[PDB]
Design brief:
With about 160 residues, this protein is an all-alpha fold. It has one domain. It is built from 8 helices and no strands. It is globular and about 45 Å long.
Amino acid sequence: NEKLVEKVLEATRRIAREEAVKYKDAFLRAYRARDGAGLRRVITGLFSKVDSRLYKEVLTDVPTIVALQRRAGVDITPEQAQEILDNYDNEKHTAAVMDETFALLARAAATQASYEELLAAAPSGSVILALEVLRVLLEINNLSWREVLPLLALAAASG
C-alpha cells in the first residue's frame, strides 16, 4: 500500500505542477486583493482540473483507491473502492472535497498548524490530494503557508 500510494502522490504532484502554472497569476491576483471567495474559486478550478485528470489517469483501479484511502486511515473493501470509481462525478466530488478541505484549512489557520500537521489530519484520501495540489500552487508562487492561511480561512466562510 505504501508503495502504490507514493506512485499516486508522484503522479498527483506532477499533474498539479503541469496545471498550476496556468492558474498561478489568477491565484496571485486573488491573494493580493485578499479576496477569500475569489481565492477559493481559483483553488477549486485547479483542483477540479487535476482531479478530473486523476480519475482518468491515476485513480483507475481498486488497489489504487484502496491504498489512497488507507493513507488517510480509512480501510475500504474492494467493492467499496469499485463503487467510488463507478460513481465518480467531477463536479459533485470537487465541491464536497473543497468543503472538507477548506474546513480543515480554517482549523489550521486558527491553530497555526504546519503543512505536515494539517496533511496528517486529512480525513480522506481526496483531502490529501487537494492539499498536495494546493501546496504546489503555493510553491510555484513562492508563497508560504503562514502568508496564505489567514485568507484560506476567510474563504472557508465564503464561496
